[PDB]
């Protein structure tokens, strides 16, 4: 049985993307310190421990699942789109996610807010004319107070509806004070939608929308994500495990249940 690792994860021959201090999801939404991972691609994306978010307090229900779907796709290729938000102020941002000289936010998200006196009833529609699926990612904002709610979105209680021809998610914000994170008691909640060719993404809301800037090009799940603090070395190796590289010469390995590439069967 194969029962030992070098301890490193060889840079060759699988394109191994070390996220350093960004997890995949932070790199996806675009946490200011993961701007480096934009449009990056991989066979295996290793998430380290250092990893810490550092932007607007958010939670992703269906995290491990959204995490996996992106991990497999192996590309982070984002495609901007011409969304037309008429009646609201775009590019919103904050001090808990500074960028450049001040207030910042997730590069891949567009915080809409009221336009002076009002927040109209938003209702865009974006058709998928292309020959590949689209993975839009959006969010809903939960102010912690009715005051906050009304300063930003006017309406006393907002709503976000993200429909396609076959689905229909209608989440409604939930005002309340969550624990403080980077000075905030507020939170955004990350959701998603995949649009199949010949389909139409339809966003209708009247409050709390955290609008998409475009879509993520999805290829086929050949890649994979893995958590490890294993060093990376310049070497050739085919079987990668959280522990490192283990030769695929023997038919059964017992090093770990998780591995990448032509690997010995786990025991």
């Amino acid at each position: 049985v194969q029962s030992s690792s070098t301890g490193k994860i060889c840079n060759n021959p699988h394109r191994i993307l070390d996220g350093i201090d960004c997890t995949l999801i932070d790199a996806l939404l675009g946490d200011p310190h993961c701007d480096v991972f934009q449009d990056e691609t991989w066979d295996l994306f290793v998430e380290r421990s250092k990893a810490f978010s550092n932007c607007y307090p958010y939670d992703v229900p269906d995290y491990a699942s959204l995490r996996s779907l992106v991990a497999s796709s192996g590309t982070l290729e984002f495609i901007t789109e011409g969304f037309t938000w008429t009646g609201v102020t775009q590019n919103g941002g904050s001090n808990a996610c500074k960028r450049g000289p001040g207030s910042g936010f997730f590069s891949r998200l567009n915080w809409l807010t009221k336009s002076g006196s009002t927040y109209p009833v938003l209702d865009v529609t974006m058709p998928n004319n292309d020959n590949f699926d689209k993975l839009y990612i959006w969010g809903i904002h939960h102010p912690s107070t009715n005051q906050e709610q009304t300063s930003l979105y006017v309406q006393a209680s907002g709503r976000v509806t993200v429909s396609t021809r076959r689905s229909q998610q209608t989440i409604i914000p939930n005002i309340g004070s969550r624990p403080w994170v980077r000075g905030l008691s507020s939170r955004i909640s990350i959701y998603w939608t995949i649009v199949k060719p010949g389909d139409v993404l339809v966003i209708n809301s009247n409050g709390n929308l955290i609008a998409p800037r475009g879509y993520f090009k999805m290829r086929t799940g050949k890649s994979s994500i893995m958590r490890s603090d294993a060093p990376i070395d310049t070497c050739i190796s085919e079987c990668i495990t959280p522990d490192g590289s283990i030769p695929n010469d023997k038919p059964f390995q017992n090093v770990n249940k998780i591995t990448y590439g032509a690997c010995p069967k786990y025991v």
Partner: antibody
Framework: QVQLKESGPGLVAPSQSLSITCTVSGFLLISNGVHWVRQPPGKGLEWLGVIWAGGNTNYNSALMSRVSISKDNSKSQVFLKMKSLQTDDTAMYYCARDFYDYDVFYYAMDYWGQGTSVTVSS | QAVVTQESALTTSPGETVTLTCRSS?????????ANWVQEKPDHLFTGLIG???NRAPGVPARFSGSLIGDKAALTITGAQTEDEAIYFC?????????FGGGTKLTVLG
């Protein structure tokens, strides 16, 4: 950096139409609003109106019947158009950037333009 | 909409601690008004100083402070210097409509 410049006529005869332009740089008109402030010779400042990031505007109740703020988001230009001009309108016309803080929730006029003088004389 | 009123001019000397004030015909100046304090320097080159009542704008030296003193808003230059001579405009927000004050001329006897 932020920056606002006003380019206008300088001299227009009573009963014509004033048209100032505030060309902003370093921020987007969809991200912020742009305000118009005029300072007649030896007087205080007067707030003309404002065009919000969302395009809707809010004018000074008084002058509203003659004012009209517009903007071409793709050119980075805000437009202050006044009609039925009368001598009183001789003043410095300024456009200042509308700012709103998302964490404390307050409005403020942070970036003022350089201004452009307009004399209404026949 | 309402009428913001403030000192015509005020004459101080270097060192002293002056306090411009900002009144509302319509009543007390609350936080709802976002008291803005603009500083007009020679040849009308305006500069933002304080916003939202007491939030000091970046370049602004620490000695400038925004506050509510009773039912009117205030600005306090603590240790005025000759370089503080300027017309200090106060602006008050009343429902998507701004209303400036008459401005104050600040002399700093040098």
């Amino acid at each position: 950096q932020v920056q606002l410049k006003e380019s206008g006529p300088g001299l227009v005869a009573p009963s014509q139409s004033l048209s100032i332009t505030c060309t902003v740089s370093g921020f987007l008109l969809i991200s912020n609003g742009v305000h118009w402030v005029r300072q007649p010779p030896g007087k205080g400042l007067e707030w003309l109106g404002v065009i919000w990031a969302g395009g809707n505007t809010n004018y000074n109740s008084a002058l509203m019947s003659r004012v009209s703020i517009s903007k071409d988001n793709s050119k980075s230009q805000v437009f202050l158009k006044m009609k039925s001009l009368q001598t009183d309108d001789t003043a410095m016309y300024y456009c200042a950037r509308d700012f709103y803080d998302y964490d404390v929730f307050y409005y403020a006029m942070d970036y003022w333009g350089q201004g452009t003088s307009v004399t209404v004389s026949s | 909409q309402a009428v913001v009123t403030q000192e015509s001019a005020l004459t101080t000397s270097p060192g002293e601690t002056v306090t411009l004030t900002c009144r509302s015909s319509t009543g007390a100046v609350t936080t709802s008004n976002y008291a803005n304090w603009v500083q007009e320097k020679p040849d009308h080159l305006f500069t933002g100083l304080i916003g939202g009542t007491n939030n000091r704008a970046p370049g602004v030296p620490a000695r400038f402070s925004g506050s509510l003193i009773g039912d009117k808003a205030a600005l306090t230059i603590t240790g005025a210097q000759t370089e503080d001579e300027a017309i200090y405009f106060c602006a008050l927000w009343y429902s998507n409509h701004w209303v400036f004050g008459g401005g104050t001329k600040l002399t700093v006897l040098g």
